[PDB]
Design an enzyme around this catalytic site. Structure first.
Site, PDB file in Angstrom:
ATOM      1  N   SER A  15     114.785   9.650  57.298  1.00 33.76           N
ATOM      2  CA  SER A  15     115.794  10.161  56.737  1.00 33.76           C
ATOM      3  C   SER A  15     117.213   9.242  57.856  1.00 33.76           C
ATOM      4  CB  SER A  15     116.843  11.082  56.513  1.00 33.76           C
ATOM      5  OG  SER A  15     116.012  11.568  55.243  1.00 33.76           O
TER       6      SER A  15
ATOM      7  N   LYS B  70     119.446   5.725  56.116  1.00 34.58           N
ATOM      8  CA  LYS B  70     119.373   6.154  55.494  1.00 34.58           C
ATOM      9  C   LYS B  70     120.739   5.153  56.283  1.00 34.58           C
ATOM     10  CE  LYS B  70     117.737   9.637  53.404  1.00 34.58           C
ATOM     11  NZ  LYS B  70     117.737  10.938  52.342  1.00 34.58           N
TER      12      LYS B  70
ATOM     13  N   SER C 251     121.682  13.878  52.620  1.00 42.42           N
ATOM     14  CA  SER C 251     120.130  13.295  52.845  1.00 42.42           C
ATOM     15  C   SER C 251     119.656  13.096  51.116  1.00 42.42           C
ATOM     16  CB  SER C 251     119.358  13.879  53.907  1.00 42.42           C
ATOM     17  OG  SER C 251     118.355  13.364  54.524  1.00 42.42           O
TER      18      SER C 251
ATOM     19  N   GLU D 238     111.502   6.194  49.457  1.00 47.95           N
ATOM     20  CA  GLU D 238     111.153   7.335  49.818  1.00 47.95           C
ATOM     21  C   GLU D 238     110.482   8.449  48.616  1.00 47.95           C
ATOM     22  OE1 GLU D 238     114.152   9.287  52.773  1.00 47.95           O
ATOM     23  OE2 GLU D 238     112.230   9.709  51.904  1.00 47.95           O
TER      24      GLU D 238
ATOM     25  N   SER E 117     113.864  14.281  58.787  1.00 50.54           N
ATOM     26  CA  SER E 117     113.048  14.868  59.042  1.00 50.54           C
ATOM     27  C   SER E 117     110.896  14.345  58.344  1.00 50.54           C
ATOM     28  CB  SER E 117     112.908  15.966  59.159  1.00 50.54           C
ATOM     29  OG  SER E 117     113.125  16.188  57.381  1.00 50.54           O
TER      30      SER E 117
HETATM   31  B1  SM2 Z   1     113.968  12.375  55.684  1.00 51.43           B
HETATM   32  O1  SM2 Z   1     113.360  10.827  54.932  1.00 51.43           O
HETATM   33  O2  SM2 Z   1     114.224  12.823  56.136  1.00 51.43           O
HETATM   34  C1  SM2 Z   1     114.124  13.296  53.926  1.00 51.43           C
HETATM   35  N1  SM2 Z   1     112.741  14.086  54.464  1.00 51.43           N
HETATM   36  C2  SM2 Z   1     111.941  14.500  53.173  1.00 51.43           C
HETATM   37  O3  SM2 Z   1     112.261  13.993  52.407  1.00 51.43           O
HETATM   38  C3  SM2 Z   1     110.830  15.079  54.023  1.00 51.43           C
HETATM   39  C4  SM2 Z   1     109.227  14.653  53.830  1.00 51.43           C
HETATM   40  C5  SM2 Z   1     108.544  14.165  52.425  1.00 51.43           C
HETATM   41  C6  SM2 Z   1     107.567  13.657  52.762  1.00 51.43           C
HETATM   42  C7  SM2 Z   1     106.727  13.904  53.397  1.00 51.43           C
HETATM   43  S1  SM2 Z   1     107.935  15.167  54.857  1.00 51.43           S
HETATM   44  C8  SM2 Z   1     115.305  14.355  54.100  1.00 51.43           C
HETATM   45  C9  SM2 Z   1     116.068  14.619  55.732  1.00 51.43           C
HETATM   46  C10 SM2 Z   1     116.474  15.343  55.474  1.00 51.43           C
HETATM   47  C11 SM2 Z   1     117.869  15.676  56.828  1.00 51.43           C
HETATM   48  O4  SM2 Z   1     117.983  15.000  57.688  1.00 51.43           O
HETATM   49  O5  SM2 Z   1     118.327  16.935  57.191  1.00 51.43           O
HETATM   50  C12 SM2 Z   1     116.412  16.553  54.219  1.00 51.43           C
HETATM   51  C13 SM2 Z   1     116.238  16.189  53.302  1.00 51.43           C
HETATM   52  C14 SM2 Z   1     115.254  15.315  52.989  1.00 51.43           C
END
Ligand code: SM2
Length: 263
Positions: free
Chosen positions: A45, A48, A105, A141, A212
């Site tokens: 993320s 972004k 996120s 995503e 993450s």
């Molecule tokens: B971002 O893409 O890191 C996001 N990640 C996800 O959607 C996790 C996964 C998807 C598929 C395999 S792992 C994200 C980041 C955060 C954060 O930065 O705290 C929170 C929620 C989602």
């Protein structure tokens, strides 16, 4: 040469079990501290920031773009979309999508930014336009988070991302109003208190974007205003050998503390 700060980062990395990448730019003197600074890491993320910045750049020639409504449909929801799911069967503006992507996120919000830019390669195109030859966004995503070791998709290097973050937030890659908006968004992040910021003195202020993904990938990129001196840009990327590894935000906090102490 290997500095004392780099040796401390190596020691942290050894005890962590994973692979750590760090890049600091101290804008007091433009000096840099790097640890695996030219190795690739999955962005997750943290990408972004580039997408939101690309839409801000588009808004420089369209004063109303950030107020443009985007339809949110049930099929647009993905795995994590705490803001977008409130607006299904309605609309969100590109400002609202940018804020949701950056501060919560929200993954649906990110996908709408990517779509506005013409797909993942539109985000890469913007990176190239502001002098970042390293960044690449290849997927939407949530599959951009697969974080498979050795896979170049959806990666950058710590050096490249620190440079770009500096240009976006402190330099002139964006117009002044847009730069200020990006900084406002980053400073209002909700997800960052356990990551870089946990390793900094309380008196310091910062804006950041976490990430993450699989392989226990745990990332943060930050612009920091320390007590009594010029801003810092700090990127901390961390990834682990097993696909189901647990998050390690404490490792990012530890890296940030080493960097802060080395100033
Ligand atoms: B971002 O893409 O890191 C996001 N990640 C996800 O959607 C996790 C996964 C998807 C598929 C395999 S792992 C994200 C980041 C955060 C954060 O930065 O705290 C929170 C929620 C989602």
């Amino acid at each position: 040469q290997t500095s004392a700060v780099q040796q401390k980062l190596a020691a942290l990395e050894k005890s962590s079990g994973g692979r750590l990448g760090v890049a600091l730019i101290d804008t007091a003197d433009n000096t840099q501290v790097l640890y695996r600074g030219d190795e690739r890491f999955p962005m997750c993320s943290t990408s972004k920031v580039m997408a939101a910045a690309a839409v801000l750049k588009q808004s420089e020639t369209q004063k109303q773009l950030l107020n443009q409504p985007v339809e949110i449909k049930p099929a647009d929801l993905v795995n994590y979309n705490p803001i977008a799911e409130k607006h299904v069967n309605g609309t969100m503006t590109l400002a609202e999508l940018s804020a949701a992507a950056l501060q919560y996120s929200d993954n649906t919000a990110m996908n709408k930014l990517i779509a506005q830019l013409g797909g993942p390669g539109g985000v890469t195109a913007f990176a190239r336009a502001i002098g970042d030859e390293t960044f690449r966004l290849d997927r939407t995503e949530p599959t951009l988070n697969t974080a498979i070791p050795g896979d170049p998709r959806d990666t950058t290097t710590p050096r490249a991302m620190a440079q770009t973050l500096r240009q976006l937030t402190l330099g002139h890659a964006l117009g002044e109003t847009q730069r200020a908006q990006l900084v406002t968004w980053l400073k209002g992040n909700t997800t960052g208190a356990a990551s870089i910021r946990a390793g900094l003195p309380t008196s310091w202020t910062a804006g950041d974007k976490t990430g993450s993904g699989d392989y226990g990938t745990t990332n943060d990129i930050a612009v920091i205003w320390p007590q009594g001196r010029a801003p810092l840009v700090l990127v901390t990327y961390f990834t682990q050998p097993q696909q189901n590894a647990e998050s390690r935000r404490d490792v990012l906090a530890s890296a940030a503390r080493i960097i802060a102490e080395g100033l």
